Amino acid sequence: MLIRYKKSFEKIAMGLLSFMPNEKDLKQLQQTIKDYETDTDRQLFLWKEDEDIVGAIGVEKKDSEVEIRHISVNPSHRHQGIGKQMMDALKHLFKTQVLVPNELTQSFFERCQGQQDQDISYN
């Protein structure tokens, strides 16, 4: 499930966000984590499979659109649908505004939109 970021998860949040291509070193990591903590328009979320944090997704609220900036899943948990479940839970969470990506996560975002939601059908 999707939970808000807490300071007690800084070590795992930095480790997860380190897989983002624009996060080269650790000095830059703690600066972006400090942005998610101290900036109102920027919020970071964590995906808790069972009781272990395996994914992370952070957004920036900008007037009418909610831009996705960072999305990362633990490599040992990839290819399990966690990446799309985070966005789906994010879309339900931000039902008020429209969910758009930036140039950093446009590739994986367009893949999920092209995907078909696997739903049951009756009659």
Ligand X SMILES: CC(C)(COP(=O)(O)OP(=O)(O)OC[C@H]1O[C@@H](n2cnc3c(N)ncnc32)[C@H](O)[C@@H]1OP(=O)(O)O)[C@@H](O)C(=O)NCCC(=O)NCCS
Residues that bind ligand X (CB under 6 A): 19-21, 71-73, 78-84, 105, 107-108, 111
What's the closest the beta carbon of residue 38 comes to ligand X, in angstroms?
24
What's the closest the beta carbon of residue 75 comes to ligand X, in angstroms?
7
Token pair of 25 as six digits: 């070193």
Taking the least distance from each CB to ligand X, the nearer of 43 and 105 is 105
Q: Which residue is nearest to ligand X (CB)?
A: 83
Question: CA angle 34-35-36, nearest 5°?
Answer: 90
| Cα-based torsion angle of the residue sequence 121, 113, 88, 57 in order, rounded to the nearest 10 degrees | 160
What's the closest the beta carbon of residue 1 comes to ligand X, in angstroms?
15
Give me the half-sphere count of Cα atoms (radius 13 Å) on the Cβ side of residue 68.
26
What's the closest the beta carbon of residue 76 comes to ligand X, in angstroms?
10
Taking the least distance from each CB to ligand X, the nearer of 11 and 79 is 79
Other CB atoms closer than 10 Å to residue 72's CB: what's the count? Answer: 23
Taking the least distance from each CB to ligand X, the nearer of 41 and 81 is 81
Taking the least distance from each CB to ligand X, the nearer of 6 and 81 is 81
Element (H, E) at 72: strand 65-73
Decide if 73 contacts 84 (C-beta within 8 A): no
